[PDB]
């Protein structure tokens, strides 16, 4: 007695005609990336994510923040790039990078991280700590 599958089989879209033509994982890292993507895929069978993951409502959690600041992407990428080639034109940067003796200013990094991407990381960590669930439902 057999029952047909309720959806597509995992290794079903791979052609089995001659196995020597198809390109191949020669690396455990490539297989690990593909397997993690396939694990994050939904799937129609029983899953550890189904039995253990948090089932939050798909309510698309409402934003009650301020509207985001507006930036001009074109001049932003222009100034980012020109910083990149002036730093790549400084000759001692190559010597420091190749001799593995370079360094990075953490205080300036943290300040403009607060300027640019700190709000989203802070929001993510607030969600992890569970204030939006507890304090703001």
């Amino acid at each position: 007695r057999r029952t047909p599958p309720l959806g597509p089989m995992p290794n079903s879209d791979i052609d089995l005609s001659n196995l020597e033509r198809l390109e191949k994982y020669r690396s455990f890292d490539r297989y690990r990336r593909r397997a993690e993507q396939e694990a994050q895929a939904p799937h129609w069978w029983r899953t550890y994510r189904e039995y253990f993951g948090e089932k939050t409502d798909p309510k698309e959690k409402i934003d009650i923040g301020l509207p985001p600041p507006k930036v001009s992407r074109t001049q932003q990428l222009l100034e980012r790039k020109q910083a990149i080639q002036e730093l790549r034109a400084n000759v001692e940067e190559e010597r420091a990078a190749r001799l593995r003796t370079a360094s990075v200013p953490l205080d300036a990094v943290r300040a403009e991280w607060e300027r640019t991407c700190g709000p989203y990381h802070k929001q993510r960590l607030a969600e992890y700590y569970g204030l939006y669930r507890d304090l703001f439902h």
Binding site: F52, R80, A102, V104, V109, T116, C117, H121, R124, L125
Partner: peptide, 30 residues
């Protein structure tokens, strides 16, 4: 569970503007 607690990337400007290249052991140390 899978929620990202903290992230740090060479994809961000705050790290890009101090690295020579984003693929070094200098990049990893930073």
């Amino acid at each position: 569970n899978g929620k990202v607690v903290v992230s740090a990337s060479t994809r961000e400007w705050a790290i890009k503007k101090h690295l020579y290249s984003t693929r070094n052991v200098v990049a990893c140390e930073s």
